[PDB]
Design an enzyme around this catalytic site. Structure first.
Site, PDB file in Angstrom:
ATOM      1  N   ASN A 375       0.829  -1.191   0.000  1.00  0.00           N
ATOM      2  CA  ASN A 375       0.000   0.000   0.000  1.00  0.00           C
ATOM      3  C   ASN A 375       0.873   1.253   0.000  1.00  0.00           C
ATOM      4  O   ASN A 375       2.096   1.192  -0.158  1.00  0.00           O
ATOM      5  CB  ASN A 375      -0.957  -0.028   1.191  1.00  0.00           C
ATOM      6  CG  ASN A 375      -0.239   0.021   2.518  1.00  0.00           C
ATOM      7  OD1 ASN A 375       0.787  -0.627   2.707  1.00  0.00           O
ATOM      8  ND2 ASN A 375      -0.779   0.791   3.450  1.00  0.00           N
ATOM      9  N   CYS A 377       1.468   3.122   2.545  1.00  0.00           N
ATOM     10  CA  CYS A 377       2.285   3.073   3.748  1.00  0.00           C
ATOM     11  C   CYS A 377       3.194   1.852   3.792  1.00  0.00           C
ATOM     12  O   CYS A 377       3.955   1.700   4.750  1.00  0.00           O
ATOM     13  CB  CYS A 377       1.394   3.109   4.993  1.00  0.00           C
ATOM     14  SG  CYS A 377       0.249   4.505   5.042  1.00  0.00           S
ATOM     15  N   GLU A 379       2.789  -1.395   4.236  1.00  0.00           N
ATOM     16  CA  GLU A 379       2.621  -2.431   5.249  1.00  0.00           C
ATOM     17  C   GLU A 379       1.451  -3.370   4.996  1.00  0.00           C
ATOM     18  O   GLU A 379       1.402  -4.433   5.619  1.00  0.00           O
ATOM     19  CB  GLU A 379       2.478  -1.802   6.647  1.00  0.00           C
ATOM     20  CG  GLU A 379       1.084  -1.810   7.251  1.00  0.00           C
ATOM     21  CD  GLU A 379       0.186  -0.736   6.684  1.00  0.00           C
ATOM     22  OE1 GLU A 379       0.713   0.232   6.102  1.00  0.00           O
ATOM     23  OE2 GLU A 379      -1.045  -0.848   6.841  1.00  0.00           O
TER      24      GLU A 379
END
Ligand SMILES: Cc1cn([C@H]2C[C@H](O)[C@@H](COP(=O)(O)OP(=O)(O)OP(=O)(O)O)O2)c(=O)[nH]c1=O
Ligand SMILES: Nc1nc2c(ncn2[C@H]2C[C@H](O)[C@@H](COP(=O)(O)OP(=O)(O)O)O2)c(=O)[nH]1
Ligand SMILES: Nc1nc2c(ncn2[C@H]2C[C@H](O)[C@@H](COP(=O)(O)OP(=O)(O)O)O2)c(=O)[nH]1
Ligand SMILES: [Mg+2]
Ligand SMILES: [Mg+2]
Ligand SMILES: [Mn+2]
Ligand SMILES: [Mn+2]
Ligand SMILES: [Mn+2]
Ligand SMILES: [Mn+2]
Lengths: 683, 289, 289, 683
Positions: A375, A377, A379
């Site tokens: 994603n 981020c 994670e």
């Protein structure tokens, strides 16, 4: 100057050779009694407050209508009975500036911390008064913190979605690219961060219906997506954030990376689009042997084999692609590509690095699909199936686009309360409710995958805060021992809660029977290896709290085999950016960057000491830049072995270290089983 | 003995105004009186004119007459800084703070201001009087250049520094400090070249060159006094600025190897307060742990 | 219509020699034959010598005669790149690959070489012939400058690009590619300044300036063919180098707003792998007919 | 240097004080005999050639199977019976470089002019041998030229669409904007120019569902569309071209115009997106009286009245909008806006000017909708209805998006053959066939409007060539007299053919009954005014040809009332860019830019004298820049009164002309009934 920020600036005034840390308590006390209580709208009774909020389009009537007002009053009493006090000025300031409800003109304050927590708890419980009280106790004790979207929007009428991470698979067609742009704008409009896999897209210089050198490559789609995210920026208060992921064996990988170079032209460079690179073990092996690697044209592979390149195993098909004359390939130097990756991360922090075989060797749902990208981020690591968006008159084949609800355990407060099991189970229930109440009516694959996979992300924060406040160095083996035991216990109780939810609702996630939970292979290391703490110091930290043994894991494995699992994915450790201030916690499981954090808000300068920072634990709060990244990799890999999804792993680099040091850190992370690397932050 | 270290210092100091975001000064600018804004605009416009001519004319012409590829490279770099970086930065400041009409008016004001025209006439006249292979005409132009770098800019620099020191207009002030940091090294470098020529002369010739330098300084000084009063009387600072320009005149003389000419005075303490990663190839052993 | 855009592109392309580590070239240099090493040295010295003329005379002389503050600034920036960046970069490459005595001998040879001298002096002759306030002589010099930037360098650039495209001498090839990228934009920019002058001329004067440009191109081209055979026959590359010269001659002509002179040819794939009328208000009665 | 290139270059070599115009016949003869006959693939029989073309994926077997091979052989016989010779080298060069069918490697030539014409005619006839022979006679005589898409692609397996002009309405919603981007990319992929109406989009700083000042305006959509057109670049063959139209009373009109300034910021400037401004009579009235005008925020008007601002009559609604406190507006100077328009047209040729009330005062389908915008070439003026593209799960409300089929009469060849009626009717039949056989699967509104409206565009070209070859000055009153009579006849026979098609098929276009054709209001000026030539010289040009009279127009009115009208729109004069060379014709109804055209192809420069240029007619071929633009406006307004759609009207300006002169030309065009102004070309 405000009195509270004047008091907060007295922390740095060193009296008797020490920072005045107690000024922040006076700072927050002054902040409240001079700004917050003055600007807080107070009603005669809670009934008038709730009626005012519902009538003026602040709250939602539907969720508040499942409780009699006596139950809502009891919930609010439970929230206010704790008499929660913010320990620092930054905690209260961040809450009342980002998450506290304000009037329509942004003038006064409608919600306190207790009001917001009670509303979120009543939203989570969905009619249950006792469950609402349990959620109130969980959040007012700050044992569990719902993510920024959920905590900010739970129970609000004019709200965005409770999910902010979305992952989209883009098929190799103009219809699918147009649908990807549309869905990206729709999800960015909702406030979510959107990640897109661009590996299935054919490279630059490929044919579009027998006319050659016609495709603009993934960089044209990258420009389209960058402008789509610039357009959907939600007033520009939080501009549209997107991420693009490309497999390292894509032919466009060099042009994909050149979009982040400082010397990139305006017709190539993308600004609002983060980039990630998916690296199979084959690429690392090729670079290790200093052999000549090949990047491939995806359309040639799809034409020759009938499958997309990223849908195939590169460690078993790379030689077949190279030997195939009908597959078009370009010669590259894998070590040169690795050095370019290191240089780009040093100069910009990009790309995100996903070690694909590290993700998929432990992935529980490879039968559904392999994890092909992360994603925004870096994670979320879940199986995805690409959609086939056809012409307007034709029906679309809807695939599975990833999205999970985020939530963080506060390791310090969970460990203080000796409530790993209860916190994990209640957080799992809340995340399940958030998943069930989410309905994205403009992203068909996101909606379908949310209904089918029922994936949630339960993270943790305050790991470094808890260790530093307990006299444990982040790099120490005792810290990794604690992380091992704690996250094994979190995994145990999350699996137990998922199995209990599946038993109660009588349903599992789609294609559960092919997962490693159903086959029992997931539990091999848990029924074979004991994860009890190896140090007496760590073992006392868990005193009064039962640590599951191999027998407990065997019983849980039997329970899962006989009842199934409700969530395909349960645990993911997100960055947890702004909720860490509110919870007075260090961000995620990463080490702290600064002991005392200096920020400027408007024309005011304020300082934030790390939670619990003092002189007795000053050196246990070692900054992330001063520590060995190999030991941080060891810690994250210790945590990662109990996390089914990934961990947002930021690399904290000094100016002295070269690109070779960054490459060594990346290769050690790949060796140690790190799934993703988020950021290369340099001081 | 010095060009290489000046080359390295100049290139390591390279900057562009776009590196500094200026929208942060918007409020402290809005809050200044009309008199203060007027003086500020005019001050920077006077600086723009000086850098325009230093970049277009002064530095290139000195570069042409100075021997040695490395000396020429330093002087060419300094010339680029004058017109491609310094002069342009002022327009970045103007375009942020002021509406187009006020910008147009201040550039019209430089054309008609008698003190600014006089100082340009005098300095540029000396640049254009340089004769090939005539070291004396070159020395005279280098003295003029040092006086521009180390003395004449300072009636202008005072005001941005005065604000910076009070925590006002700090982004514009950051630009000005970078410009000032450059001019300080430019004045030293040109000063050293001037001293080279001076040191070749007879004692009699040296005595005449000192007369030239001091007469020129006094003539420029008297004009700068009138310019300073014209700009600063409306903000009440003329006497303070005068002390500052005398201070810097002494620095210009020192850059030329001459004794200070003005007596020391206390300068406004506010103004005093106003003052890629390395690529290393991967080894085979880096892939095993 | 174009100077601010070129300003932006120029300053964002800024680079320094120190950024590229050169020592790793010795790992491929040692494996070249004597003829390859000889050709490379001679080509490199040719480029160095021509670029020095451009830094000391070509760019500064054009900056001197062109009117416009913004144009003078861009031209100053380009002159800086020649003297401060390019010249140091060529020196660095030489010092890495050859010992001091070998460098001195190669420069002695190339300094005496008939074909290098012919083109160097032809270009310099046109720069020396510019007369104050005479736009015709300025145009002729600009044509010479464009021919150097966009055409004459390329018989030389061929070889480093040829190695660079094969994986040989990659560090110096990266440097050469950055230099070449600067010369390309220099040629385009000076070309636009020449077209501005050309467009101010009568039809008869235009035809006369076209004849000048084509005649000059022909003289330089015939000497380039001889220069090419002199350097590249010993390494068997002259045929392909000649195609590259013509292709770049056509680019130079297009920079000057002229039609291509030579037929289109494909280039060696290894080298490719290396590579406002008048605003008037409406005064009423214009709405009635 | 090729021999034909040398011969063509000898035209400029002046012999005996005159150009050697006869060298172009030698040039084309040499071109053929030395290159075309050498590079033309020859087959033993036509059957072998046809089999090779169908089996090697060059032709379509569907349309060729409609005839026995004897019929196809006779059609090819008819094409070659004319022994057509290209009069100039440029005609043959343009045909054999742009339209002639080449091998897949583009090395040899499969199609001659006769083969291309035969294939186009066989595709037009759709199984009728006599009709195919009639089309062959019409095209080999060069009386009618199908548009570049139709002529190039008809009967080809690997062909683009036969339509290249599309007009899309964009609704004020993210769903509709994303759908507009998708449809624009899909149509640009087919090779068609796309025009988008941006007037419904709310301006910058408008509210998005209670979040005020959140809309980026029409410029964000402009950037999205510009990148969409850059990406959909027709498989890297020809640059993607699109147009955006905005009403002059739109609030974002100044931002809309600033996208074309030379000093425009890179985050504002659009490169591949042409702009057109729609000007109602209200704006011209406000500028005439120098009253300060108001531009309106469209969403406020939509909220107040339930109708879009561009859906309402500004002449009656402007005062109501201004006096409405709930309608948001800002003051503008209409004269300053006009001067800005003129300055922008002088600098860059943009925007196109569409006089809204000139179009709609003679529009025959105002009941369906008013004409709100034009195409990329500023001649298509048809009613459109905006589509309501809803969420993915919901059903979309498909409107009408404009797309008409182009064809051009050769005025010189039609006039010399005395075949206005026959050529017009056959061209109408061919355009109708192209309309029926066009099916676009990714633009639902375009497809619906093509099926319902059945609109075609029949243009004309070689007006200046015909006039100059007949000793008539373009600005002369006799030229306007000829244009009046000729285009009255063209309109008469196009209406007659449309009514005949309606009678044959028993169907009219959708919502015909509300049109002015049904009520007879269309025919008022034709049953009241006589359009026969007023000059004896012009009346002699029409000798042997029946000019329709008032009684003929009354009979046509009765016929249309009885049987209806098949095409909502019939006539539009497109620029006819490249097909003019093949037809040896001057482009469209515009006057010639240059007497002799100097162009460079490859490394060789070519010379193209205007068709029929000689010593006797040299000064009748007056260049457009030397002409009085008022007289050109008079000519185009004379033609425009017989054309139901618009005319591509390019302004040819001298360098000495000021902004005031361009504004005067625009205002005189508005006064004279000009519907659209295409380009401001300055010498
Ligand atoms: C239409 C178009 C496609 N493409 C690229 C993007 C897509 O990933 C890829 C596929 O386009 P498609 O939409 O699938 O085109 P197609 O189906 O007609 O071609 P094919 O038979 O090969 O599938 O082509 C461009 O780069 N530019 C364009 O204009
Ligand atoms: N009175 C009041 N109570 C509020 C408000 N916001 C939150 N509360 C909480 C405080 C208590 O825990 C709970 C009940 O408050 P109340 O309605 O005044 O009841 P009570 O104090 O009469 O029992 O609601 C508020 O605005 N007013
Ligand atoms: N032979 C032949 N004829 C061609 C070709 N392309 C177009 N034609 C046209 C020419 C004639 O008008 C028509 C029939 O040609 P044919 O098959 O040779 O006929 P025939 O004269 O033998 O009866 O086809 C072609 O390639 N070969
Ligand atoms: Mg496809
Ligand atoms: Mg809407
Ligand atoms: Mn300066
Ligand atoms: Mn200086
Ligand atoms: Mn150079
Ligand atoms: Mn150069």
């Amino acid at each position: 100057v405000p009195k509270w920020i004047q008091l907060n600036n007295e922390i740095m005034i060193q009296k008797d050779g020490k920072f005045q840390f107690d000024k922040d308590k006076e700072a927050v006390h002054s902040y409240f009694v001079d700004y917050i209580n003055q600007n807080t709208v107070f009603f005669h009774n809670l009934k008038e407050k709730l009626d005012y909020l519902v009538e003026n389009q602040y709250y939602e009537e539907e969720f508040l209508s499942l409780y009699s007002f006596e139950d809502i009053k009891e919930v609010f009493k439970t929230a206010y009975a704790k008499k929660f006090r913010f320990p620092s000025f930054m905690s209260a300031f961040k809450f009342y500036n980002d998450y506290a409800l304000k009037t329509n003109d942004k003038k006064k304050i409608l919600e306190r911390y207790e009001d917001r927590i009670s509303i979120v708890a009543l939203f989570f419980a969905n009619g249950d008064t006792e469950k609402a009280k349990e959620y109130v106790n969980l959040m007012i004790n700050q044992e569990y913190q719902p993510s920024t979207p959920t905590f900010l929007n739970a129970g609000r009428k004019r709200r965005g979605e409770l999910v902010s991470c979305f992952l989209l698979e883009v098929n190799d067609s103009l219809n699918d690219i147009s649908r990807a742009i549309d869905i990206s704008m729709q999800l960015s409009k909702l406030g979510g961060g959107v990640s897109l896999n661009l590996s299935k897209l054919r490279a630059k210089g490929e044919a579009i219906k027998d006319v050659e050198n016609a495709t603009k490559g993934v960089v044209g789609v990258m420009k389209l997506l960058d402008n789509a995210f610039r357009y959907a920026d939600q007033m520009g208060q939080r501009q549209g954030s997107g991420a693009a992921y490309l497999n390292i064996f894509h032919r466009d990988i060099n042009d994909f990376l050149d979009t982040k170079k400082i010397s990139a032209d305006e017709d190539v460079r993308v600004k609002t689009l983060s980039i990630g690179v998916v690296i199979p073990d084959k690429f690392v092996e090729l670079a290790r042997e200093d052999k000549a690697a090949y990047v491939f044209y995806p359309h040639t592979i799809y034409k020759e084999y009938g499958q997309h390149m990223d849908e195939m195993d590169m460690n078993e098909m790379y030689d077949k692609f190279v030997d195939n004359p009908r597959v078009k390939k370009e010669k590259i130097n894998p070590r040169k590509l690795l050095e370019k990756l290191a240089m780009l991360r040093s100069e910009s922090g990009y790309p995100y690095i996903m070690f694909q075989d590290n993700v998929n060797k432990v992935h529980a749902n490879n039968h559904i699909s392999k994890v092909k990208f992360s994603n925004l981020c870096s994670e979320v690591l879940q199986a995805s199936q690409v959609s086939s968006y056809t012409d307007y008159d034709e029906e679309d084949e809807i695939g599975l686009d990833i999205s999970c609800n985020l939530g963080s355990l506060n390791i310090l407060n969970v460990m203080e309360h000796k409530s790993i099991e209860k916190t994990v189970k209640l957080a799992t229930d809340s995340l399940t409710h958030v998943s069930e109440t989410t309905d994205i009516r403009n992203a068909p694959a996101v909606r379908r995958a949310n209904k089918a996979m029922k994936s949630i992300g339960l993270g943790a924060m305050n790991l470094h805060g808890y260790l530093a406040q307990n006299g444990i160095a982040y790099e120490s083996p005792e810290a990794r021992d604690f992380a091992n035991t704690f996250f094994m216990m979190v995994n145990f109780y999350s699996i137990q809660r998922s199995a209990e939810i599946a038993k109660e609702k009588g349903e599992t996630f789609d294609q559960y029977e092919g997962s490693t939970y159903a086959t029992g292979e997931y539990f091999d290391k848990y029924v074979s290896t004991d994860f009890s703490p190896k140090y007496e110091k760590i073992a006392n930290l868990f005193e009064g709290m039962h640590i599951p043994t191999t027998e407990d894991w065997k019983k849980l494995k039997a329970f899962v085999a006989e009842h199934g699992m409700y969530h395909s994915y349960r645990l993911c450790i997100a960055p947890t950016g702004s909720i860490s201030y509110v919870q007075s916690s260090t961000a995620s499981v990463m080490p702290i960057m600064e002991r005392i954090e200096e920020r400027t808000y408007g024309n005011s300068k304020t300082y934030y000491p790390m939670p619990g920072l003092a002189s007795n634990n000053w050196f246990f709060y070692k900054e992330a830049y001063d520590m060995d990244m190999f030991k941080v990799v060891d810690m994250i890999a210790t945590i990662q072995q109990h996390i089914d999804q990934g961990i947002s792993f930021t690399l904290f680099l000094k100016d002295t270290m070269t690109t070779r040091d960054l490459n060594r850190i990346d290769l050690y992370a790949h060796h140690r089983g790190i799934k993703t690397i988020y950021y290369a932050r340099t001081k | 003995d010095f060009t290489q270290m000046f080359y390295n210092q100049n290139v390591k100091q390279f900057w562009l105004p776009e590196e500094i975001a200026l929208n942060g000064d918007l409020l402290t600018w809005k809050y200044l009186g009309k008199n203060e804004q007027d003086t500020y605009m005019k001050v920077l416009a006077g600086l723009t004119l000086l850098d325009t001519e230093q970049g277009n004319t002064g530095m290139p012409i000195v570069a042409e007459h100075v021997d040695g590829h490395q000396r020429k490279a330093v002087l060419n770099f300094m010339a680029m800084m004058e017109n491609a970086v310094h002069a342009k930065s002022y327009s970045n400041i103007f375009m942020t703070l002021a509406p187009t009409e006020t910008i147009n008016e201040v550039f019209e004001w430089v054309k008609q201001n008698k003190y600014l025209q006089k100082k340009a006439q005098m300095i540029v006249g000396l640049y254009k009087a340089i004769q090939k292979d005539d070291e004396i005409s070159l020395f005279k132009a280098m003295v003029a250049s040092v006086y521009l770098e180390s003395f004449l800019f300072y009636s202008g620099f005072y005001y941005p520094l005065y604000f910076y020191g009070q925590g006002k207009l700090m982004q514009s002030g950051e630009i000005i400090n970078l410009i000032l940091r450059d001019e300080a090294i430019h004045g030293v470098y040109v000063g050293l070249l001037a001293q080279e020529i001076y040191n070749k002369q007879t004692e009699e010739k040296k005595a005449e060159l000192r007369e030239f330098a001091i007469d020129l300084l006094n003539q420029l000084y008297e004009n700068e006094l009138e310019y300073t009063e014209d700009l600063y009387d409306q903000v009440g600072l003329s006497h303070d600025v005068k002390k500052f320009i005398r201070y810097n005149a002494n620095k210009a003389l020192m850059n030329l190897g001459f004794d200070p000419y003005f007596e020391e005075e206390d300068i406004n303490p506010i103004v005093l307060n106003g003052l890629k990663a390395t690529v290393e190839p991967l080894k085979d052993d880096d892939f095993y742990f």
